[PDB]
Amino acid sequence: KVQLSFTLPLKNNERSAEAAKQIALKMGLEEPSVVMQQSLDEEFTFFVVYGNEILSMEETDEYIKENIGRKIVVVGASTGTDAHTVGIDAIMNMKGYAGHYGLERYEMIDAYNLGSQVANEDFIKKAVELEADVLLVSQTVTQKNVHIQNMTHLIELLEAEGLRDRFVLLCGGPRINNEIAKELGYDAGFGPGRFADDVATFAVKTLNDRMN
Amino acid sequence: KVQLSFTLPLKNNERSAEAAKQIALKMGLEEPSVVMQQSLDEEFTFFVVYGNEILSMEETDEYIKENIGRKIVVVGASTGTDAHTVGIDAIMNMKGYAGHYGLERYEMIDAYNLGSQVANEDFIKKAVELEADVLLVSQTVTQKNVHIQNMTHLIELLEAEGLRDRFVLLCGGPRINNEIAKELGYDAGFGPGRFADDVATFAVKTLNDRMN
Amino acid sequence: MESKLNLDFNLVEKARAKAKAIAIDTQEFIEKHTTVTVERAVCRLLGIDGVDTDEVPLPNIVVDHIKENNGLNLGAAMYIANAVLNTGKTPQEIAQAISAGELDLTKLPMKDLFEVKTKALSMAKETVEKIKNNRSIRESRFEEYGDKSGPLLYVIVATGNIYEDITQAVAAAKQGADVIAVIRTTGQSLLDYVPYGATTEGFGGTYATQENFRLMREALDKVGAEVGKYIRLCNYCSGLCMPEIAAMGAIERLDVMLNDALYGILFRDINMQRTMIDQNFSRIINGFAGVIINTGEDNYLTTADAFEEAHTVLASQFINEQFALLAGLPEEQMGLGHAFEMDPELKNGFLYELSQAQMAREIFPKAPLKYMPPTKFMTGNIFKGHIQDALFNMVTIMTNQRIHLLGMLTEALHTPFMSDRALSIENAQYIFNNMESISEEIQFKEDGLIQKRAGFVLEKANELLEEIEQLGLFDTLEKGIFGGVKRPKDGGKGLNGVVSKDENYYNPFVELMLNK
Amino acid sequence: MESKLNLDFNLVEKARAKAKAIAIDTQEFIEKHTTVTVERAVCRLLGIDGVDTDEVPLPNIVVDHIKENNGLNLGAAMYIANAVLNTGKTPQEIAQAISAGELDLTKLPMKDLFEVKTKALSMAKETVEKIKNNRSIRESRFEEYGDKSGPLLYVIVATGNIYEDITQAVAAAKQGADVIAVIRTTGQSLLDYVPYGATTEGFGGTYATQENFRLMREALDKVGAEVGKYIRLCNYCSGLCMPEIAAMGAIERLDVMLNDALYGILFRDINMQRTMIDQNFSRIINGFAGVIINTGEDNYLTTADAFEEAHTVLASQFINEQFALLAGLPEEQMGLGHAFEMDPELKNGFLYELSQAQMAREIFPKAPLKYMPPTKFMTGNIFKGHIQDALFNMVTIMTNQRIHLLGMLTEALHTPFMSDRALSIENAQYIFNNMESISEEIQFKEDGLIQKRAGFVLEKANELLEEIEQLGLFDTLEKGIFGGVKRPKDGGKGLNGVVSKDENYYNPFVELMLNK
Ligand code: B12
Ligand code: B12
Ligand SMILES: C[C@H]1O[C@@H](n2cnc3c(N)ncnc32)[C@H](O)[C@@H]1O
Ligand SMILES: C[C@H]1O[C@@H](n2cnc3c(N)ncnc32)[C@H](O)[C@@H]1O
Ligand SMILES: *Cc1c(COP(=O)(O)O)cnc(C)c1O
Ligand SMILES: *Cc1c(COP(=O)(O)O)cnc(C)c1O
């Protein structure tokens, strides 16, 4: 690892940013990270980098005000018989997970964590109530595909009552991914490496695309 | 130009220092300068460097105490008819030249600047008086080799009275160099790129070699 | 501490009285109950350890046993003791036997109450000794080595791999650190069991494990004698196993541990009742163990606007103070926390920070206060960051804070490198030494910004605690009046692990460690 | 300025009286003489410029002319004027003619004294106007643009190539700098003539040249209106041509210039008599021109032990003050200097620095004090250096210094890069803004280190000036009692350029610019 700083003579762009990455790798073992980038002049720019899109909380909150105009509400839970909750707690808790703060920590967001073992029938009752914009269902046990059955059932339920489209349905859990997600009826699925910011940035853009 | 910092896992040596230079050049256009080098542990060391022996005042002063044991005295001047003095002032003045402080600024050194146009006969009278250890003669005009004649004469004078060896005779000036210097009788000659520290570090070591 | 702010100590005493009301009121509730986690702690204090086959900690199975047979209200201690009486096997063996399905604490004849209870108390008595001794072990090392009187440098290590944490901890130990904390795995406070054994892998940092504690302590002890200093070790109590983690560190003897009353509730959605019962007993153990706890007020400043949340922090500190007291923890053991988190572009901002830091110092004069570094505004500009870590260092020496959590120039970028740690320490030693007497030398103008800022924060915290006292703590949390967070009296995680005490309940450890 | 140190102002007034004695005493000497350099300045003020064939400045030849014909004691002004009377050619043409060997000021009929003298005075009168107007030009720009009230950021440029200096100066101008100084070529104060024309190459920095001044001023004026600020330009007066460089900048209108009474003597071995006569007249011109001078007390701290030389610095400041006065320069024009040069490893060191900086501020309440950055202990550790530049920045805002010479994290390494300059300015703006009112807020304990340090320095400076006053300035220098440096009353460079005034001497410029 190496700390390396310098300054290029290009207006402060994401291009110059790249130039920075270039000039970095171009000088030995890389995988550069341009930690800081600020301009000294409209024609000059300083750089700090280390070597060898996802909105952020501040941003997604702005995006919500300038694009949606009201606080959005999200209801999540570990549905069915699944008692695993650490996961949904990683995205929904104030404290969040590994540095990424949960959705309840966001200003333009009302996150309602209903916890573990929530019957789809109850989940839906609760989404209609707190008038949710985003539904979050987490699944962990894959035993006899009890999860695929359960997530599939929640979709039928929603649709049978003519409700699916009212929501951005997100699913995730250790054995989940976006491929599995889409072919089941959900708008997106999030695996073990994802965090609240990943969810937030996706939910907010989708909302916007829909509300148009 | 580039600012670059990192840390190697080697005891804080001049070798690790080199390793630092190596690891630097090894990573693109170089001519590295290891600006700072300090250890975090006996087995580790931090580095700061930039890319694309000469004692220092504190040191030569120590060297003088631990090796010579008394303040040394130096008498310099622009000899003969030569009115050029900026040069000798660059090595002897308190303020020195381009950052390198003059000999009179040193603690274990009494520098006596006699200025311009000093007849060799007077120069010697003055060296014997302030009992000099180091004589400094500066020459600039080379016209009809009036300088070579003059510097040559000062040597004869000194020797005729049996005095040469009592002193470390240094000469220098714009058209001077150590080759010219040695083949004339002087212990060293210093060209236009040299500074007081260069002179000091040489005079002090020579004194030591002699006093043994 | 002299009064440099001309603070109104009547107001101070008035605020503190409200915190005491709020606390005692909630205490009435705590005493009338126990929790699944309290009992597992009790089991551990009595020697039950190890795991079963599916890697479930034996304390969880023995207590889970008693639980489903409607026994918890009496509390582990009795059954465990009863069992030992007519059975004569060690509680460790009582556990394995219960695991194997070879015993049933619910069906053994229940000998005379006064007989087991006495047995209970005799068992408790042993481990309390081990603990009491560890406290002496520490006192004994300080007197041999001496202890810094200025601020203590507190650094963090966290690879997720214990053996790796150690090589980093000992390096940091001689690099000059006085307190070393191993960052607990992200989210561990959500687990309802403590993993068993050494940990070699973990996200966001190393798991909290009794074995892990032992290794680290053994290490620090080695490098300690080396440098002739006693490195204080620190870990986190927060979560559904607070007491257990506290009993755990009491026996391996950590020196400081994070122990906040409202953390779990406000930031991990752990049920308030469950949380208030767990903190009470973890605090008792820590207190008796001579441990210095750390509160987490920084959590209130890392995201909210730090300038306008200063009274929440002061109120939080008061409230933690009062509970710690109800658990026998004295002021010289309460490492209350605060932080340098105001925006660096705020005019006179540094004057407001200094003021508040000075305020807390005068309000809690005997507490070894914990002052934390800036993090929310720390950016990729490593140069600017080093200087705002410097203004942070200045406040500590100007206000005599005691536990100094060193800021890192690389803060917003990654866990520190060998270099990041060194630079951070030299920065702190330069400032601490260059400005050594600055707090005696410096005074504040009559009714200027500094003094007026402090009194506004104090008047506001008093105002907040007045409402909190009007509603009682649970109602306060139900309506989000504190921390901008609303939480359900019967919501959150762990409520199902809370049981009311029945008339014959008995924790021999309380009278041994508290005793009023 | 309020009295935060509880300084004994009687002692203060007592010290200042000794400086005034010392000065007036030396003044008796200055008035009884003139120097080769004074006269060349007089010639320039009257329009003589350009060079001859071998590139010798015409002012040097016209005055060298008068010199060898035993004429200087009367002083250029007369001959030049006499010549213009019976000849009717411009002094510029008088010069060329004298260069060509076509005239001889010594052999022209010397018309009636009162007639040429009057002519002299009428000539002086013109250029004084150009000057007086430039002073208005500046006043006029300030009122249009306004001026910062806090500390002024002073930065340095020096490529050796004027056109290059300019691209750097304008960049720095908008990067936020308030005062720009072009570092003069190393050793220029040793030259007895001012180079003529623009400079494209030079060691240690760009030559000081009237053409060079004009270019830079033209530039700064351009970027100035751009940013809507009036960038102050600065250069060095030090050396054998002090007055000339001052007359020079008076006509091109630099805003601040280095002008120390003892510099040349103590650090460049320029003869004391020559030096004391040159500084007197350069100071008159600068003063009348509205220029703020800068003294070089840092020279006393960059190598000697700064903690024990603090009284030398304070004495130096007093002494410069008193001379500036004898030359008509008011306190709001004396940018007396000092520095943050104590060892960073010194315990309570920052408290001693703050104290002295506060001392000078209270002693010279109307002076736009110049506080300089650390340099001797600035090392390759760019990180540590940035923070000691920060502690330096703090002193300025805590003590209300007015001219702030920004320190560079790269100080000990090389002239700053674009980045080094930016970082240095943000560091200063962060501290200046974050601690904005810190000087009103902060006070110092009764008789603590801070206040006691200041009074010791003051008592010591008074003690020093008492001996200096006992011997008079020349004797003081002859024995090294001041600055640890001994210099010969008739030694050093330039004594041969010093002449005593004869009864008919006349500088029309003195009465026009001073007039008592
Ligand atoms: C803790 C734990 C428990 C706890 C749960 C604690 C709690 N409060 O949640 C308890 C003890 C109750 C438990 C019980 C059981 N468990 Co378990 N448990 C675990 C363990 C150790 C950790 C899980 C964890 O919390 N990981 C941390 C979180 C952060 O990871 P994550 O779920 O992957 O979350 C990430 C992404 O998935 C995403 N995400 C998750 N959900 C969602 C939803 C949305 C909408 C979005 C956007 C993103 C998202 O966010 C996170 C990244 O930030 C795992 C083993 C392991 N190491 O995984 C077994 C494991 C899940 N358990 C297992 C089993 C077998 C069981 C039990 C059947 C055991 C028993 N009693 O026999 C029961 C089931 C109980 C039930 N009814 O559900 C198996 C399941 C195997 C399978 N695939 O079928 C596992 C994998 C262990 C094993 N290898 O055998 N368990
Ligand atoms: C300034 C100057 C003058 C000044 C002197 C000012 C003064 N106070 O010293 C004055 C006006 C008096 C002068 C006069 C003359 N000058 Co003239 N002058 C110059 C000029 C512009 C600058 C010299 C300088 O000071 N350089 C700066 C110093 C720092 O450089 P330096 O001498 O090389 O010093 C370095 C090393 O040499 C070393 N060093 C020097 N001496 C020593 C001694 C020791 C012991 C050591 C260890 C090191 C050391 O230290 C320095 C590095 O740090 C040069 C042209 C030029 N650019 O060089 C002509 C130049 C030297 N002058 C020249 C001439 C022709 C003359 C005159 C004859 C002109 C005339 N009147 O016709 C006279 C001679 C007068 C005399 N009797 O000596 C010529 C000489 C050509 C030749 N080789 O013969 C030069 C080179 C110009 C030219 N190109 O025509 N001059
Ligand atoms: C699913 C994982 O959770 C842990 N675990 C801890 N307590 C329990 C419990 N009561 N039941 C089941 N698993 C448990 C085990 O370590 C197991 O492997
Ligand atoms: C030797 C160099 O010094 C400069 N110079 C300045 N003044 C004089 C003087 N009086 N005599 C000779 N050279 C002089 C010229 O520029 C010349 O080239
Ligand atoms: C951040 C923090 C932790 C770590 O929390 P987990 O909830 O275990 O992820 C523990 N205690 C406090 C007080 C904290 O601030
Ligand atoms: C360092 C300095 C200079 C530059 O000096 P030269 O003597 O021209 O090399 C000028 N004036 C002052 C006051 C200085 O400190």
Tell whether ligand 2 has an atom less than 6 A from the beta carbon of residue B86: yes
Q: Which of C347, C386, C438 sits opposite D387 (nearest CB)?
A: C386
Distance of CA D75 to the CA centre of its chain: 25
Neighbours of C227 (CB within 10 A): 13
- SS3 assignment, position B135: strand
- State the closest ligand 2 atom to the C-alpha of B82, by its place in the atom list counted from 1: 78
> By C-alpha distance, which of D384, D390, D380, D388 is closest to D414?
D380
User: Does residue C110 belong to the interface with chain B, where contact is any CB pair within 8 Å?
Assistant: no
Give the nearest chain D residue to A47 (CA atoms). D419
Contacts of B46 in chain C (CB under 8 A): 418-419, 422
CA distances from A89 to A85, A197, C450, C483, D349 (A): 6, 13, 41, 19, 51
Closest-CA residue to D389 (of D368, D359, D362, D416):
D416
Of B36, B93, B98, the CB nearest to D204: B98
Nearest alpha-carbon partner for D248 in D209, D221, D297:
D209
Q: Do B7 and C171 touch (CB under 8 A)?
A: no
User: Which residue ranges form the domains of chain B, and what is each CATH number?
Assistant: 1-52 (3.30.30.60), 53-212 (3.40.50.280)
Longest dimension (CA), chain C: 75
Cα(B198) to ligand 3 centroid in Å equals 75
Does the beta carbon of D495 lie under 8 angstroms from any beta carbon of chain B? no
CB B137 within 8 A of CB B77: yes
Distance (Å) of CA C30 to CA C23, C199, C241, D41, D462? 10, 34, 16, 92, 72
DSSP at D207: P
Distance from CA of D472 to the nearest CA of A (A): 53
Is D298 a residue of the active site? yes
**How many CB contacts within 8 angstroms connect chain A with chain D?**
18
CB contact under 8 A, B46 and C175: no
Binding residues of A: 81-87, 136-143, 170-174, 190-195
- Taking the C-alpha atoms of residue C79 and residue C48, their distance in angstroms, rounded to an integer, is 13
Strands B72-78 and B134-138, by their bridges, are parallel
Q: List all residues 6 or more positions away from C101 whose beta carbon is below 8 Å from its beta carbon.
A: none
B-interface mutation test, from C418, C420, C421, C430, most B Cβ less than 10 A away: C418
Task: Cite the beta strand spans of D137-287 per DSSP E.
Answer: 152-157, 179-182, 232-236, 256-258
Tokens 């203004």 correspond to what residue?
C391
B149 min Cα distance to partner chain D (Å): 26
Annotated active-site residue in C178, C260, C278, C298? C298
Alpha carbon D122 to chain centroid, angstroms = 29
Whose structure tokens read 């709020």? C22
**DSSP designation for C497:** G
B36: which chain D residues are within 8 Å (Cβ-Cβ)?
379-382
Q: Give the nearest ligand 3 atom to C51 CA.
A: 16
Query: What does DSSP assign to residue A65?
Result: I
Closest chain C residue to the Cα of B37, Cα to Cα = C419
- For A31, counting Cβ atoms within 10 Å of its Cβ (0-12 exposed, 13-18 middle, 19+ buried), the class is exposed
Write out chain C residues lying below 8 Å of A57, CB-based.
Answer: 303
The helix/strand/coil state of C499 is: strand
Extract the tokens encoding D445. Answer: 């304990």
Chain mean position to CA D215: 21
Q: Are the C-beta atoms of C293 and C257 separated by less than 8 Å?
A: yes
Residue nearest to atom 10 of ligand 6 (CA): D238
For CA atoms A97, A101, A105, A110, the dihedral sign is negative
- B84 Cβ below 6 A of ligand 2: yes
Distance C53 CA to ligand 5 centre (A): 29
In 3D space, the residue among A19, A46, A17, A22 whose CA is nearest the CA of residue A34 turns out to be A17
Distance in angstroms (rounded) separating the CA atoms of residues D262 and D324: 12
Closest chain A residue to B49, measured at CA: A4
C197 CA from centroid of ligand 1 (Å): 20
Burial of C102 (0-12, 13-18, 19+ CB in 10 A): exposed
10 Å CB burial of residue A210 (0-12, 13-18, 19+) is exposed
By alpha-carbon position, which residue is closest to atom 15 of ligand 6? Answer: D296
Contact flag B40-C174 (C-beta cutoff 8 Å): no
A17 CB-near residues (< 8 Å, 6+ apart)? A34, A37
CA B199 to centroid of ligand 2, rounded, Å: 19
The Cα C266–Cα C272 span in angstroms is 9
Task: Ligand 1: list residues with CB < 6 Å.
Answer: A 76, 81-88, 90-91, 97, 136-138, 140-143, 170-175, 190-192, 194-195, 199; C 190
| Contact with chain A for residue C382, Cβ under 8 A | yes
The CA distance from D277 to D498, in Å, is 8
- Cα angle C344, C349, C351 (rounded to 5 degrees) comes to 135
Q: Which residue of B has its CA nearest to D268?
A: B93
Task: Tell me the C-alpha distance between D449 and D471, whole Å.
Answer: 33
The bound ligand whose nearest atom lies closest to the alpha carbon of C241 is 5
* Structure tokens that stand for A105 in this block: 């920590």
Atom of ligand 1 nearest to the CA of A81: 77
Q: Which H or E element spans position B22? A: helix B14-25
Q: Do D383 and C386 touch (CB under 8 A)?
A: yes
CB contact under 8 A, B6 and A3: yes
Q: What is the distance of C-alpha C337 from the center of its chain? A: 10
What is the layout of strands, in order, in the sheet containing A188-190? A109-113, A72-78, A134-138, A168-172, A188-190
* Domains observed in chain C: 1-516 (3.20.20.440)
Residues in chain A: 212
**CA–CA distance, C92 with B63 (Å, rounded to integer):** 72
Nearest CA to ligand 4 atom 16: D55
Contacts for D320-324: CB closer than 8 Å, 24+ residues apart: D320/D260, D320/D261, D320/D295, D321/D16, D321/D19, D321/D364, D321/D367, D322/D16, D322/D19, D322/D20, D322/D22, D322/D23, D322/D24, D323/D23, D323/D26, D323/D27, D323/D261, D323/D279, D323/D280, D323/D283, D324/D283, D324/D287, D324/D293
A6 to chain B: closest CA residue: B2
Running DSSP on this structure, what letter comes out for residue C34?
E
Q: Angle at which helices D449-478 and D349-363 pack, to 10 degrees? A: 70
The catalytic residues of A are 95
C99 CB within 6 A, ligand 3 = no
Angle of CA points C485, C486, C491, to nearest 5°: 130
CA distance A6 to chain B (A): 5
First to last CA, chain D: 29
- D56 CB under 6 A from ligand 4? yes
Residue whose entry in the numeric block shows the structure tokens 């109120």:
C315
**Which tokens hold the place of C80?**
């465990």
Distance, in Å, from the CA atom of C297 to the CA atom of C357, rounded to the nearest integer, reads: 13
User: Are A167 and A186 in contact, with CB atoms under 8 Å apart?
Assistant: no
Annotated binding-site ranges of C for adenosylcob(III)alamin = 54-56
Which resolution in angstroms does this entry have? 2.8
Judged by a CB distance cut-off of 8 A, whether residue C50 touches chain D is: no
Q: Which residue, among A100, A55, A152, has the nearest Cα to A89 in the 3D structure?
A: A100
Helix C58-68 to helix C91-100 angle, to the nearest 10 degrees?
70
Please work out whether the CB of residue D193 comes within 6 Å of at least one atom of ligand 4. Answer: yes
* C22 CB-near residues (< 8 Å, 6+ apart): C319, C322, C465, C468, C469, C472, C473
Q: What span, in angstroms and rounded, lies between the C-alpha atoms of C261 and C26?
A: 12
